[PDB]
RNA sequence: CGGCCGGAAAGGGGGCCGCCCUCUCGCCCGUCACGCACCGCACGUUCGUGGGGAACCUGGCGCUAAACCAUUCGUAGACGAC
RNA sequence: CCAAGCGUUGGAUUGUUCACCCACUAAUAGGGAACGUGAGCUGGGUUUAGACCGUCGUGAGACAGGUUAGUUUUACCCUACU
RNA sequence: GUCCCUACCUACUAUCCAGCGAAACCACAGCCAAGGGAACGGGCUUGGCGGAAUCAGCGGGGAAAGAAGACCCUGUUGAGC
RNA sequence: GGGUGGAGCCGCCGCAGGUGCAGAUCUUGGUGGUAGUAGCAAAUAUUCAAACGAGAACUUUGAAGGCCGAAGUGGAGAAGGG
RNA sequence: GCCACUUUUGGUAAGCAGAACUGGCGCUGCGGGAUGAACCGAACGCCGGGUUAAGGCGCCCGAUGCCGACGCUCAUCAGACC
């Protein structure tokens, strides 16, 4: 009932375009690890566009101005809001449906993340072109938490490595079980092979 | 005479009316909204504390330019004022309605004020004298007060 | 058209919401960054401002025109009783910041610290921490407490201990003490919590936190001055005498076509009582308090090694509008923020300070303790009556 | 039903050692019929002891607080606020 | 070249914008925001009604000619800002 | 103290309260950047965004208010000379 | 249809007009927001007790402290008022 | 009166002034050109179904969520529709 998308390797607006329409269609989308979002073009052009966004500012009172959110999750939230019709109730309901995180927090580390190949940098860029990491751009422009998110992601990669080793040895036990019991599940296996589940 | 809403039980409800009372409508409406839900003895000690500036009337609707006070945080409002003759006219009216419940044969100490209503009376004029030989009006704003008390346990 | 003669801008936009501050005691926006090589130490303290005094000292800086000459310098005295540690707070680092993990208080908490949890100590029946203090004298309770000290050892990064002032030693009217989280910068989380819980519930004086001849930063709200105009708040130029609608103003608010008034325009509002943080105040002296020895009290705080008098830091007739400084104090170079009797948060410097004006050793010669309630001309009572002789009162 | 651990980024209704109980019922093929067969006809089938609100309720282990006004201070103050 | 972060002044003359000179300076750069800025001020000049002069007109009077004296009104509304 | 360079004290206000209490003004009304537009928007378009009710000031903006421009022109409209 | 009201009213065929309002800085009358707002600030100043009284900062009496200061906030006229 | 394809006069030029042919706007909505008197399509009674024009089809925003075709293009100022 909830899409959990990974953010690593996805282009910024090219991911936000699928996410915007998918949230207007009533899904609940959690785009996680948004410091791994790529942006096409090289890093200096991308941070010049973001510093131009910083210079654009309400003159008489910048407290009313464009709130330049520096966190990567909220840069991606602002670009989904740019693609959504947020001045009305259905666009605001869409922004209530969307949740966006930096790193992978504990509600969603224990779940499996989806990927969108239609927004993914290994597909929609030529391999010789330059790209730019949104997390390093956001740290470069005033987000303060690259180091703590990096250490927390190192911790969750370790704990997921422990989980993956145990899942591997479980599935080794499963296949040794199948080879020990194939003589008495052979009549159940071949009726699956004739219907094309198991060859 | 003809009141706005009749009481839901006429047998245990006393009534009181006053027309053309030379007190300000905006000061009287909001002390009536202050004492609208109260018990009768609680309402009388409220109005006498309003006269003695110990508890205020929160000005909620007729709100502009009246400054703040600290005694209105117990009303949940930042503004308040202590209108003494506006307290005193409807304090006389509480004494009238209490006398009427005594005349009708009711339990005085069980009277919750249910209905209270302040209307605008016909304005009566005076003159003021302005610059450059002009005349502007100096209108009074009296009010009509209407009040119904009902026995409740 | 442009501005005819260019002139620099009145005031600073860095301190811009010039409002009455929400908090009375100044808070520390940043402690020094801890490194695990140091021993553990508190990185702040909290003392109250008493008054102002001269000093006289010989300056040994090579190359100045005041080398080995003898200046006078204005100093400030912050009466600084030892603070009582009451609880430790842990913090975990999050991608959203640094949130508090598990606050753990002591068993016995002094009533002057208990007063802080009450807007009205009179009408309350003083019930605070009474269900909590039972968690120390039962076995299931202190198993729970060893559990969350073990959790704070595992999951926290910075550890800061609650400490309050000891108000019953001060000449002030109030009794309600001030509580403060002071960051324990030093070794690891293990050694940090060990130090914190072993000095839990007991005192800590000034000299364990600060050393003499050390640049510190002073934090506090300023002396409030009320709702004041642009001339007395923003120091704009007074318009000339001939002005029709009053002269102590700003003439042109803003241009036409930016159809608002910018936030940078100097306008009339609250002046004073702003939170401020000044840096690099040098401690000249950390005075010992009044204490008893062999029956009589030893008092000579303002005695130096070049004076050897018997006078204390208290002037004649006490500090004006404050009282008598009896226990420990720090004596700082120049002025600090806030009025008399004002809570005034001290802390360490974030900067490393390798320059000789921050590294000047301080030998005081004379602390001018004459009366501040007028033009005092005598250092002490004995000198005054020995100069004036017998009066008619004797 | 008792004990052991596993969680802190926004903490796991998980795993394990026995227990008195009780089962060859759970699953896959078959034998046997029965269950309003409501007479062609829609929102059926769940997460649902769902979120929030009232009194009817019967027990057990537990708790009897602060805030605001008013008075005072004057480190504060146009009035509030502090 | 990157670069407007930070400065770019005090005065004599003139109503001056301009101009010129004395003096310090690190430098005395140029400008915009309804040729910023009159419910912000001042009212020196232009630009009412009084007057004197020169020229023009027979005259009433005219002068991008000079001179002198000549009422500068209101915010308590909404926004903005403090 | 005209100014460098402002500071402080007093009276009467303004502030708050008890009583009494108007007027000017008002299409609906009020947050901005840009676009186009009757060539300078509060409304339209695209964005930025937006949180009750309010108090003391303030003079940016409402091309703020008053007064059917007094300057210029048109009038087969006049008057003083 | 319902309510209120308490003495006249309509349909059709012809006729006759002082016959249909959103505006005219329209005319007359009423009523809003502003708004319990601006303000009730020229000429030094009031205080205590008592009396009448339903009620007193404002009336009256006594005491005190002030002012006008003989070109007066004094004692009398003329015009005007009636 | 104004605008526009093309012809054309004055002026360096103009969202300038002046003509000729025809179409428009004024008097006119509707789809497109984001926005818009004049441009592109198209002229209108109230509606149901189908289909188009001009313009479009990442998302706002209906429609390319084609396994679209062939190339060019790196911008520390990319480019993007009378
Ligand atoms: Mg209101
Ligand atoms: Mg107001
Ligand atoms: Mg008058
Ligand atoms: Mg007159
Ligand atoms: Mg300049
Ligand atoms: Mg003047
Ligand atoms: Mg002194
Ligand atoms: Mg001069
Ligand atoms: Mg100008
Ligand atoms: Mg003006
Ligand atoms: Mg102006
Ligand atoms: Mg002049
Ligand atoms: Mg002649
Ligand atoms: Mg006012
Ligand atoms: Mg009043
Ligand atoms: Mg609209
Ligand atoms: Mg204005
Ligand atoms: Mg005007
Ligand atoms: Mg006229
Ligand atoms: Mg005209
Ligand atoms: Mg003609
Ligand atoms: Mg004539
Ligand atoms: Mg009749
Ligand atoms: Mg007729
Ligand atoms: Mg009408
Ligand atoms: Mg009519
Ligand atoms: Mg007023
Ligand atoms: Mg007389
Ligand atoms: Mg007389
Ligand atoms: Mg033309
Ligand atoms: Mg036509
Ligand atoms: Mg058309
Ligand atoms: Mg366009
Ligand atoms: Mg066409
Ligand atoms: Mg064509
Ligand atoms: Mg159709
Ligand atoms: Mg489109």
Curated annotation (Swiss-Prot), chain B:
Key words, A-Z: Cytoplasm, Ribonucleoprotein, Ribosomal protein
Encoding gene (name): RPL17
UniProt record similarity statement: Belongs to the universal ribosomal protein uL22 family.
Protein name: Large ribosomal subunit protein uL22
UniProt GO cellular component terms: cytosolic large ribosomal subunit
Localization per record: Cytoplasm
Sample GO molecular function, one term: structural constituent of ribosome
Span covered, complete protein: 2 to 154 of 184
Summary of subunit composition and partner proteins: Component of the large ribosomal subunit.
Keyword Ribonucleoprotein in annotation: yes
Phylogenetic placement of the source organism: Eukaryota, Metazoa, Chordata, Craniata, Vertebrata
Mitochondrion is among the record's keywords: no
Gene Ontology terms describing biological process: cytoplasmic translation
Cited function: Component of the large ribosomal subunit. The ribosome is a large ribonucleoprotein complex responsible for the synthesis of proteins in the cell.
UniProtKB/Swiss-Prot annotation, chain C:
Tele-methylhistidine PTM sites in chain numbering: 244
Cross-link named Glycyl lysine isopeptide (Lys-Gly) (interchain with G-Cter in SUMO1), sites: 293
Modification Phosphoserine, positions: 12, 303
GO biological process assignments: translation
InterPro entries for the chain: L3_arc_euk, Ribosomal_L3_dom_3_arc_sf, Ribosomal_uL3, Ribosomal_uL3_CS, Transl_B-barrel_sf
GO MF, any single term: RNA binding
PROSITE patterns: RIBOSOMAL_L3
GO CC annotations, alphabetized: cytosolic large ribosomal subunit; nucleolus
Basic residues bias (residue ranges): 17-30
Compartments reported by the entry: Nucleus, Nucleolus; Cytoplasm
Glycyl lysine isopeptide (Lys-Gly) (interchain with G-Cter in SUMO2) cross-link site: 38, 223, 225, 285, 365, 385, 392
UniProt modification remark: Constitutively monomethylated at His-244 by METTL18. Methylation at His-244 regulates translation elongation by slowing ribosome traversal on tyrosine codons: slower elongation provides enough time for proper folding of synthesized proteins and prevents cellular aggregation of tyrosine-rich proteins. It is not required for incorporation of RPL3 into ribosomes.
Record family assignment: Belongs to the universal ribosomal protein uL3 family.
Function: Component of the large ribosomal subunit. The ribosome is a large ribonucleoprotein complex responsible for the synthesis of proteins in the cell.
Oligomeric and partner information: Component of the large ribosomal subunit. Interacts with DHX33.
Name under which the protein is recorded: Large ribosomal subunit protein uL3
Organism, scientific name: Oryctolagus cuniculus
């Amino acid at each position: 009932q909830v899409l959990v998308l990974d953010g690593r390797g996805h282009l910024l607006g090219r991911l936000a375009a699928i996410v915007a329409k998918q949230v207007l269609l009533g899904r609940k989308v959690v785009v996680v690890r948004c410091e791994g979002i790529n942006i096409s073009g090289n890093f200096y052009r991308n941070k010049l566009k973001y510093l131009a966004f910083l210079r654009k500012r309400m003159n008489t009172n910048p407290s009313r101005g464009p709130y330049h959110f520096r966190a990567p999750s909220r840069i991606f939230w602002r670009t989904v809001r740019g693609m959504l019709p947020h001045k009305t109730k259905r666009g605001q309901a869409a922004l209530d449906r969307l949740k966006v995180f930096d790193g992978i927090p504990p509600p969603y580390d224990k779940k499996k993340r989806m990927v969108v190949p239609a927004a993914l940098k290994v597909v929609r860029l030529k391999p010789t072109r330059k790209f730019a990491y949104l997390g390093r751009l956001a740290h470069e422009v005033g987000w303060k938490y690259q180091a703590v998110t990096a250490t927390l992601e190192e911790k969750r990669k370790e704990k997921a490595k422990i989980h993956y080793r145990k899942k591997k040895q479980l599935m080794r036990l499963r296949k040794q079980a199948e080879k020990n019991v194939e003589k008495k599940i052979s009549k159940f296996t071949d009726v699956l092979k004739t219907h094309g589940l198991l060859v | 005479v003809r009141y706005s809403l009749d009481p839901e039980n006429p047998t245990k409800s006393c009534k009181s009316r006053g027309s053309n009372l030379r007190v300000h409508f905006k000061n009287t409406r909001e002390t009536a909204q202050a004492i609208k839900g109260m018990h009768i003895r609680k309402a009388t000690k409220y109005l006498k504390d309003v006269t003695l500036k110990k508890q205020c009337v929160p000005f909620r609707r007729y709100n502009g330019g009246v400054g703040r006070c600290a005694q209105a945080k117990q009303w949940g409002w930042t503004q308040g004022r202590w209108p003494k003759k506006s307290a005193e006219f409807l304090l006389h009216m509480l004494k009238n309605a209490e006398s009427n419940a005594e005349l009708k044969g009711l339990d005085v100490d069980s009277l919750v004020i249910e209905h209270i209503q302040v209307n605008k009376a016909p304005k009566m004029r005076r003159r003021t004298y302005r610059a450059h030989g002009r005349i502007n009006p100096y209108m009074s704003s009296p009010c009509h007060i209407e009040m119904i008390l009902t026995e409740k346990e | 058209s442009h501005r005819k003669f260019s002139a620099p801008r009145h005031g600073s936009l860095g301190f811009l919401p010039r409002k009455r501050s929400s908090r009375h005691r100044g808070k520390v926006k940043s402690f020094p960054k801890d490194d695990p090589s140091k021993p553990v130490h508190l990185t702040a303290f909290l003392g109250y401002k008493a008054g102002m005094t001269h000093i006289v000292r010989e300056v040994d800086r090579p190359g100045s025109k005041v080398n080995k000459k003898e200046v006078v310098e204005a100093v400030t005295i912050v009466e600084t009783p030892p603070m009582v540690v009451v609880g430790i707070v842990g913090y975990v680092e999050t991608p959203r910041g640094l949130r508090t993990f598990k606050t753990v208080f002591a068993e016995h908490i002094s009533d002057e610290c208990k007063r802080r949890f009450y807007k009205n100590w009179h009408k309350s029946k003083k019930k605070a921490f009474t269900k909590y203090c039972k968690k120390w004298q039962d076995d299931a309770g202190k198993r729970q407490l060893d559990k969350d000290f073990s959790s704070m050892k595992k999951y926290c990064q910075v550890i800061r201990v609650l400490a309050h002032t000891q108000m019953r030693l001060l000449p002030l009217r109030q009794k309600k003490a001030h509580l403060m989280e002071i960051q324990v910068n030093g070794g690891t989380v293990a050694e940090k919590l060990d130090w914190a819980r072993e000095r839990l519930e007991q005192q800590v004086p000034v000299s364990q936190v600060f050393g003499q001849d050390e640049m510190i930063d002073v934090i506090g709200v300023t002396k409030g001055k009320g709702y004041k105009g642009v001339t007395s708040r923003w120091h704009t130029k007074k318009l000339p005498r001939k002005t029709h609608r009053g002269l102590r103003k700003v003439a042109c608010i803003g241009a036409w076509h930016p159809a608002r008034v910018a936030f940078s325009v100097a306008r009339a509002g609250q002046k004073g009582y702003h939170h401020r943080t000044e840096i690099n105040k040098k401690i000249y002296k950390i005075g010992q308090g009044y204490l008893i020895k062999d029956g009589k009290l030893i008092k000579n705080n303002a005695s130096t090694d070049y004076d050897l008098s018997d006078k204390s830091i208290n002037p004649l007739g006490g500090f004006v509008h404050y009282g008598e400084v009896t226990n420990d104090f720090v004596m700082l170079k120049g002025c600090v923020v806030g009025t008399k009797k004002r809570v005034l948060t001290l802390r360490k410097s974030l900067l490393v300070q390798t320059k000789r004006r921050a590294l000047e050793k301080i030998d005081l010669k004379f602390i001018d303790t004459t009366s501040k309630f007028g033009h005092g001309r005598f250092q002490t009572v004995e000198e005054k009556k020995a100069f004036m002789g017998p009066l008619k009162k004797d």
